[PDB]
Write a protein that binds this ligand. Structure first.
Ligand code: NH4
Ligand code: NH4
Lengths: 420, 423
């Protein structure tokens, strides 16, 4: 009546695929990130005069190495029935499986491999254009692919079909927290015995006048016209986030499964914490504290064992300060022994993909024992007195990291990830 | 390493459906063989092949949905129709459960997992027009919240002080089952002691119905009395419904200590992907077989112990047959000794809420040991030779444990099954 004990398995990360404003491809992206590079640029197009915002972080497109070329992954015929985020997700999943050396062929390997890829927001423009087409050209001009193009779970569905992944098929949609939940849920499915491998992550492409209008009106997007300075987490002059686009996918695998096939293992997922603010759609950051605490409890590790936090910090006056507070309250005097950085200066806020790209960055920090910098942080206010890895990457017991994702609607998640 | 896997029970249900509002009222009408499927009305729906749907009945009578009972007039303009229905369903579920967290400890011990299959499309297109015409300054600050899938779970959490795990899935027709299954796993794992779990969807509009008709998913039958008929020779697509279902899941000892009324125990949860087609089901039903088997394995139950299956069967030619094939394959000779029914003839297909409403029906089936019928099933092809509880409700008494399955299969080939049992 109190329950039964069951085997709870260890879970590792063996592959990473990245489609980001810093570029495409695992170690290329990590190099640029560590080298202090950024993908934030000025918005181009006449359609953007209607909005106060003038910057964003785009995925670089083209045929050079490190650029995104859709035609490498999908046919011209597929591009009509798939949204841009779905295409980005297929690219990232392909690169992740290649990075892992996992290409399931047998029925047993296919059924043992699932997919958990989330999306924060559906493609607004596709809905917008179809509505107008329906109203002016009639029913029979609506694409038969409209529904399959606009469902949140379609990226996970398409990756499953493309790579014949037949295990659990799951898609979360929790705004900025989306990518973190996808990795955590996958971790849990594997530990529980539902799958031996999970292809997990997040994707989003929300850069459009309407989307940016919506976010400008509902939250704080920076109005800074200088793309080199717009996004500055923890900085006195921070004034809102910068929208990015992209997809990040990780291959999670049961430990003995990985060892048996002699996979290269980046890191171990130790813990997963979740909480709700239950406040507003909190300057003390209580929700953030409870979520980090939950991840520590899940991992069975003490606060003093943590050496690195990849912060959610999106460059907002209230948000960055609340997270800083939650960190200080939880870690107390140990807060001064660890390092904290936000990589959003480099990628922008990738929304649905943010938690996944940052889980990948934390995974690589564990692997390389090196910390990506917080860009643009040349000074700080008294309350910001921690080591935020300002400007330049730093070299760095077991290496244990946390990565935080806090989303619209008060939904919070933290992942605890460690070196092996 | 081994870890404690706690037991999880259902202590409250709140239903907002085309059959009406209020869990036990809806159950009585379902068992009595009622349906909420009606004809569409208005020039707005001209030119679209589908002319039927299932609406939540609105008004101030018993069993009717009155928005004002749950959200204030000013709060309406800040949230979508699905969000409002989820708030209503959640309020009813927590009232049914007798769970209303007050202390910080009870608040942090209680989370929310409510999903949505699809955001109402009309807010996007209307806002787009408003933005193109009146400009930036007239775009609502609530537009983003209205189009985020996770906003139902967020609003329910704020409104009811739920500070535990805050989670939202969006897996089309499988949404509601995932929300319940994920909550089960969170409780069993120790992340929360109580979860407010379910699904909501309210997206019957010209554009949505045009979309699903173009994908060739919907019934083209103009007769609402006959349009939806799972397992029937003349089935020709599903009927879109709307609504919300919320269930209160709770750790077993937690429920016992407070003397909660316990409907049923959640035993198991299984998941799979067809990896076949983005909208069409695997004709072999291999995906369905796999998530049912996975549910039984999670539950520690043998096929021969299952007495009832609440089928996904939405009344499509290929879908219904593929599921029938999966049950026959998995259960073998025992397929003829269990009962299977689809309640979509009564509620329509509630999309994001379907897996949650049908988890609720399966739970009540366990509690009452009575099986809701498949409507409109007056005859069948030779391949449909099982007991589909045709037309009229059946009592299902056993001296052994009543154990049921509920299936949800969605676009994208995403499958889930829940295993729920009497106590
Ligand atoms: N993060
Ligand atoms: N079902």
């Amino acid at each position: 009546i109190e329950g039964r004990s069951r085997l709870h398995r260890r879970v590792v990360i063996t592959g990473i695929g990245l489609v980001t404003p810093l570029g495409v491809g695992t170690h290329l992206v990590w190099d640029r990130l560590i080298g202090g590079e950024s993908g934030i640029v000025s918005l181009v197009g006449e359609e953007y005069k209607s909005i106060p915002c003038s910057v964003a972080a785009y995925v670089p497109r083209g045929s050079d190495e490190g650029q995104f070329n859709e035609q490498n992954f999908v046919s011209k015929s597929d591009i009509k029935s798939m949204s841009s985020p779905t295409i980005m997700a297929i690219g990232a999943a392909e690169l992740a499986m290649k990075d892992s050396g996992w290409h399931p062929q047998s029925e047993a390997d296919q059924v043992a491999t699932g997919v958990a890829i989330g999306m924060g927001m559906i493609p607004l423009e596709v809905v917008s254009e179809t509505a107008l087409n329906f109203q002016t050209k009639g029913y029979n001009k609506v694409s038969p692919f409209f529904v399959p193009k606009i469902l949140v779970n379609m990226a996970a569905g398409q990756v499953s079909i493309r790579y014949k992944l037949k295990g659990p098929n799951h898609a979360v949609s929790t705004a900025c927290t989306t990518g973190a939940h996808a990795v955590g849920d996958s971790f849990r499915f594997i530990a529980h015995g539902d799958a031996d491998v999970m292809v997990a992550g997040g994707t989003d492409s929300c850069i459009s006048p309407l989307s940016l209008a919506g976010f400008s009106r509902a939250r704080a997007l920076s109005t800074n016209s200088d793309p080199k300075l717009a996004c500055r987490p923890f900085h006195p002059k921070r004034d809102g986030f910068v929208m990015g686009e992209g997809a990040a996918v990780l291959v999670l695998e049961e430990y003995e499964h990985a060892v048996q096939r002699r996979a290269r293992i980046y890191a171990e997922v130790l813990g997963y914490g979740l909480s709700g603010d239950a406040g507003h759609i909190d300057p003390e950051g209580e929700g953030a504290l409870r979520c980090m605490a939950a991840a520590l409890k899940d991992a069975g590790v003490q606060p003093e064992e943590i050496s690195y936090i990849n912060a959610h910090a999106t460059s907002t006056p209230l948000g960055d300060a609340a997270e800083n507070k939650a960190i200080k309250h939880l870690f107390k005097d140990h807060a001064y022994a660890l390092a904290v950085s936000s990589t959003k200066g480099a990628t922008g806020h990738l929304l649905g993909a943010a938690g996944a790209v940052e889980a990948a960055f934390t995974t690589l920090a564990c692997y390389y024992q090196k910390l990506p910098p917080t860009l643009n942080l040349d000074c700080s206010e008294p309350e910001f007195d921690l080591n935020y890895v300002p400007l330049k990457a730093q070299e760095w017991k077991r290496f244990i990291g946390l990565t935080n994702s806090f989303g619209f609607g008060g939904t919070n998640a933290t992942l605890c990830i460690a070196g092996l």
